Design a protein around this ligand. Structure first.
Ligand SMILES: [Mg+2]
Length: 178
């Protein structure tokens, strides 16, 4: 209302799969998301990024000044996903999220943190969310710090949680609460 809101997001559609291919064949992006040992193709992108591997999944495109610059997937934690995050089963509505900025000229600008704040507020007010959780690699300092700036708190360590570029990486469970 005072300044123009620059960070936004929109639902992903099938036309966005060409951006996903670009981002996930860019070694600069793969260094931080999925890994430079992943060899993506139109086929793998269409398979991974259209799969209904949880009951409630949303895929979104992160935007800056209307420019599409990254991707997020948001899903409700239910069933065995609780055990995957080492998060206790609860009747509260818990969402998990993964995200990346695929356009490196927009890194280190506060966009990821602002995207996290905007989507957390959307989940709270539109989806009746009680909490959002994340599991970044503990040594992905850029991500951890952005999540902390958005109000996520580390609630425990997740040892040997992710294999990334051949190394079993400890992660941290981070939580944002309503
Ligand atoms: Mg994750």
């Amino acid at each position: 209302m005072l300044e123009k809101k620059r960070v936004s997001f929109r639902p992903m559609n099938e036309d966005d799969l060409v951006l996903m291919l670009k981002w996930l064949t860019d070694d600069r992006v793969l260094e931080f998301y999925d890994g430079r040992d992943k060899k993506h193709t139109q086929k793998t992108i269409r398979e991974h990024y259209t799969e209904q591997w949880a009951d409630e999944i949303y895929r979104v495109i992160i935007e800056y000044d209307t420019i599409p610059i990254g991707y997020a997937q948001i899903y409700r934690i239910q069933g065995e996903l609780f055990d995957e995050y080492n998060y206790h089963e609860t009747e509260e509505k818990i969402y998990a999220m993964d995200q990346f900025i695929g356009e490196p000229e927009y890194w280190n600008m506060g966009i990821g943190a602002e995207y996290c704040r905007v989507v957390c507020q959307y989940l709270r007010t539109e989806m009746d969310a009680d909490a959002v959780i994340l599991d970044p690699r503990k040594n992905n300092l850029r991500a951890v710090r952005a999540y902390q700036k958005a109000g996520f708190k580390i609630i425990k360590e997740l040892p040997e949680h992710e294999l990334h570029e051949g190394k079993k990486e400890d992660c941290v469970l981070m939580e944002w609460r309503v």
